[PDB]
């Protein structure tokens, strides 16, 4: 029960999207559910990088393409690391993934 809330939220959100995306899902709901993802996609459009993914496909940069998509969804893990960092901090411990050699 320690971190069940975060795991259940991702499942619920992704399932609802897949059930309606490309069919009848409204754009307003998408930004409400995942505002940070929209904030990333619209930034690329504002910074003249709307075709960045297409550019990577032209050069076949598979590693960059995978990193690009992963970074666009990396905020999904932010709540878990913030909670785990706070747990370590109240106990005075340092969080592993935060360290250079961790």
């Amino acid at each position: 029960e320690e971190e069940e809330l975060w795991l259940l939220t991702l499942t619920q959100q992704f399932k609802h999207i897949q059930k309606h995306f490309g069919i009848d899902l409204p754009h307003s709901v998408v930004a409400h559910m995942d505002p940070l993802l929209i904030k990333k996609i619209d930034w690329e459009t504002t910074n003249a990088l709307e075709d960045f993914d297409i550019t990577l496909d032209d050069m076949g940069a598979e590693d960059a393409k995978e990193q690009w998509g992963a970074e666009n969804l990396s905020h999904h893990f932010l709540p878990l690391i913030r909670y785990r960092r706070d747990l370590a901090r109240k106990n005075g411990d340092r969080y592993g993934p935060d360290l250079v050699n961790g």
Partner: protein
């Protein structure tokens, strides 16, 4: 007739310019093109007139507009709005900024991210510190760090670096916002001068965040560093390298920072180059390779 007879050989010589010296002899020693580039540069150098005496005239306008509270109640409207443009014109008076901090303090909790950013930038130009105002500001940012943008946070952090003020909660909230709540390519549009300021701020605080460092390192490149002034570039490099050596983090993009110094070492002193090469070997051991300079051709 004669016009065409002259036009043909005139164009003939112009056609030699787009060649890697294919003809027997084309490239010339005088290099007249240098004069043309320098001529244009001289004009912009004059354009950069500071007009320092006019700053007093601007002060007069400011005093005869918002400062006389008899005309308008300063605390009633929008301190972030007027203060942003007034400081942009060079009006930096500590006495007026004191009135501004007291007028805005009850409203900081309701300001937008754009307003908070502009207000913070204004206080940087004024170099005025109010501990109570910055406390409310950092509380707003920590409460809404997801809404802020890297371009905004970089300017805000620069103010937190001008005067040594930091909070452990603020440091993590800012790092998380840039690392995860913003686009991972945003540093490329940021400019290396702002990135080095952020690096120094975290280095002096000893706050180790390898995820943040890996993100900020992406902004450093020959393109971004080449856009800065030679003096500003030197100071930027010397400060950035110290932060990397402090945390012991050596990303691959650090070679662009070092290359900017080794391509023009005449600007640097022997003691500066000594610590530069000290970081170079440290990074070479960390990355497991050897540094080599690349030449165009």
């Amino acid at each position: 007739a004669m016009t065409r007879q002259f036009s043909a050989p005139g164009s003939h010589e112009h056609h030699e310019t787009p060649l890697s010296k294919v003809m027997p002899t084309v490239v010339s020693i005088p290099r007249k093109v240098a004069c043309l580039a320098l001529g244009a540069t001289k004009k912009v150098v004059c354009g950069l007139a500071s007009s320092g005496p006019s700053q007093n005239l601007v002060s007069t306008f400011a005093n005869k507009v918002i400062v006389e509270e008899n005309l308008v109640n300063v605390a009633e409207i929008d301190v972030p709005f007027w203060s942003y443009w007034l400081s942009s014109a060079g009006f930096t008076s500590k006495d007026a900024f004191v009135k501004f901090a007291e007028a805005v303090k009850p409203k900081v909790a309701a300001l937008s991210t754009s307003d908070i950013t502009n207000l913070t930038v204004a206080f940087k130009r004024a170099n005025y510190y109010d501990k109570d105002l910055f406390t409310g500001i950092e509380a707003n940012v920590s409460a809404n760090f997801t809404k802020f943008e890297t371009e905004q946070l970089l300017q805000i952090v620069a103010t937190f670096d001008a005067f040594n003020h930091s909070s452990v909660a603020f440091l993590d909230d800012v790092a998380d916002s840039i690392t995860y709540c913003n686009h991972y390519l945003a540093p490329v549009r940021a400019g290396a001068d702002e990135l080095a300021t952020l690096l120094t701020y975290y280095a002096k605080n000893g706050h180790e965040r390898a995820d943040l460092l890996a993100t900020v390192a992406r902004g450093f490149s020959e393109v971004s560093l080449g856009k800065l002034s030679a003096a500003q570039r030197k100071d930027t490099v010397l400060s950035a390298l110290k932060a990397f050596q402090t945390f012991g983090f050596y990303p691959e993009s650090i070679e662009a920072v070092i290359g900017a110094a080794l391509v023009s070492p005449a600007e640097y002193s022997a003691e500066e180059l000594k610590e530069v090469e000290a970081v170079k070997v440290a990074a070479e051991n960390a990355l497991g390779g050897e540094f080599v300079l690349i030449q165009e051709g």
